């Protein structure tokens, strides 16, 4: 009856392992709970893609834009301060009759704060388009990008 003995010993091993595990868990549940609570970030690392963690909830326009000239930058407009520019044109402001006029800033920091603020404040003033065209501003924009 060797097979019966083997079955008995393996089933006893299973039951005894269950009892050992139950006793150890009963006496160490709080311990492993504190261990998990203090090591919660060790369960799954945030680099499952092999790349650093990225919070998709936080928006960034630099992630997708692949052409530099599409981006908005603060550039010194000589004799008149700092202006925000891109290949689309300049950040503009409304005139008395809904016109587009170049929005000028006193300091670099103010221009940066206006340009990169998450508030929708984009007003394109292309100096090379048919409605409002002039050679000086178009050449400056071409030379500053």
């Amino acid at each position: 009856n060797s097979l019966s003995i083997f079955f008995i010993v393996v089933a006893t091993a299973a039951v005894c392992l269950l009892f050992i595990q139950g006793y150890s868990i009963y006496e160490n549940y709080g311990n492993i709970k504190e261990f998990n609570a203090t090591h919660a970030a060790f369960e799954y690392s945030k680099s499952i893609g092999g790349t650093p963690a990225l919070d998709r909830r936080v928006q960034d326009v630099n992630d997708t834009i692949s052409d530099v000239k599409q981006k908005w930058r603060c550039v010194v407009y000589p004799g008149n301060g700092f202006v925000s520019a891109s290949i689309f044109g300049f950040q503009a402001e409304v005139g008395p009759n809904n016109t587009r006029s170049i929005r000028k800033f006193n300091t670099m920091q103010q221009c940066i704060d206006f340009t990169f603020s998450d508030v929708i404040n984009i007003n394109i003033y292309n100096p090379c388009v048919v409605p409002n065209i002039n050679n000086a501003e178009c050449q400056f924009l071409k030379s500053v990008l």
Partner: protein, 162 residues
């Protein structure tokens, strides 16, 4: 005969109980699975990260001796991106402006000379500087990786001696 059927039914009952245990979102089941997953990673990475963090705290204490502006944010160019870094005033470790609950805010550069990325990084320094992430122990305790043994990374040694 009858004992065989009784044992059969008992095994089915224990299987149903284990089904309950596994698929009922139990606290004990969850803690045990979490514990296995957490324990392996702790064994893998905790000592490496602690030793490396102590060594880089030593290196940052040596580096900050004399310098006064080493503890303010500067936009550092890492080739493909910008990071608003500084030296932590307490642990003397590299610190960066964090993006939400993820890693540092890496401002991508579309070309080699990207002014817009520089300026957005400056905007982060002036505005979003309240959320910061430090290499090593803090990065391991918050993100699960320390950044020292991952490349390319702004904490890794290869990306910094390159």
């Amino acid at each position: 005969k009858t004992s065989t059927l009784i044992f059969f039914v008992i095994i089915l009952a224990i299987s149903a109980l284990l089904l309950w245990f596994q698929t009922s979102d139990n606290p004990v089941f969850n803690e045990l699975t979490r514990y296995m997953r957490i324990k392996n990673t702790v064994n893998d990475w905790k000592s490496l990260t602690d030793s490396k963090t102590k060594l880089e705290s030593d290196r940052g204490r040596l580096l900050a001796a004399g310098k006064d502006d080493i503890f303010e944010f500067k936009c550092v160019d890492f080739g493909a991106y910008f990071i608003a870094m500084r030296l932590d005033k307490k642990t003397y470790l590299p610190q960066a402006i964090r993006r939400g609950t993820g890693d540092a805010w890496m401002v991508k550069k579309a070309a080699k000379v990207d002014p817009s990325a520089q300026q957005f990084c400056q905007y982060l320094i002036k505005h979003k500087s309240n959320n910061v992430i430090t290499c090593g122990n803090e990065m391991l305790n918050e993100l699960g990786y320390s950044g020292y043994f991952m490349s390319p990374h702004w904490c890794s040694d290869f990306s910094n001696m390159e």
